[PDB]
Design a protein around this nucleic acid. Structure first.
Ligand SMILES: [Zn+2]
Ligand SMILES: [Zn+2]
Ligand SMILES: [Zn+2]
Ligand SMILES: [Zn+2]
Lengths: 75, 73
DNA sequence: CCAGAACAGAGTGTTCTG
DNA sequence: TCAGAACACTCTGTTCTG
């Protein structure tokens, strides 16, 4: 019943862009799709995305958003 | 061109004992005097280049040290 | 309840000084 | 020579508004 962000594992704010997510991931995603998302992974594109590390790799974070199914169409 | 021994960017000069770029110069100071324990989201193997240096402070900091940067020398 | 705007704070990198 | 201050800009995340 306390429920978890499907992207970083932080506690979720609600349903955003179709996926159970935290507020930071909600706005991160909005920002990534509206703008240029060309991000480079410094790793192997498997970076661990959690509450402390999610700022490290926008590229892996954004890929996790897409895998979870986030999209603007909402509704 | 002589290149930064940390991120490979074009080096401005010799800083904190090592030949490095200026962003690396000020990153290192900031790291050393500020706390911190940085944590890698990878394998402690991150690629550090001009673009990628921003991604992993842990691996950046490590590479600074293994290059011999220190506040004294 | 949710999208988006606003607000405020952290982090990077430059330019400038002596 | 290079260290440091200060500036300017980008990024993240929380609170506010509709
Ligand atoms: Zn999240
Ligand atoms: Zn990554
Ligand atoms: Zn460098
Ligand atoms: Zn790393």
């Amino acid at each position: 019943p306390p429920k978890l962000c499907l992207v970083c594992g932080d506690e979720a704010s609600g349903c955003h862009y179709g996926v159970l997510t935290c507020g930071s991931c909600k706005v991160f995603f909005k920002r990534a799709v509206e703008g240029q998302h060309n991000y480079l992974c410094a790793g192997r594109n498997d970076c661990i995305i959690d509450k402390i590390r999610r700022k490290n790799c926008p590229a892996c974070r954004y890929r996790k958003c897409l895998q979870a199914g986030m999209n603007l169409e909402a509704r």
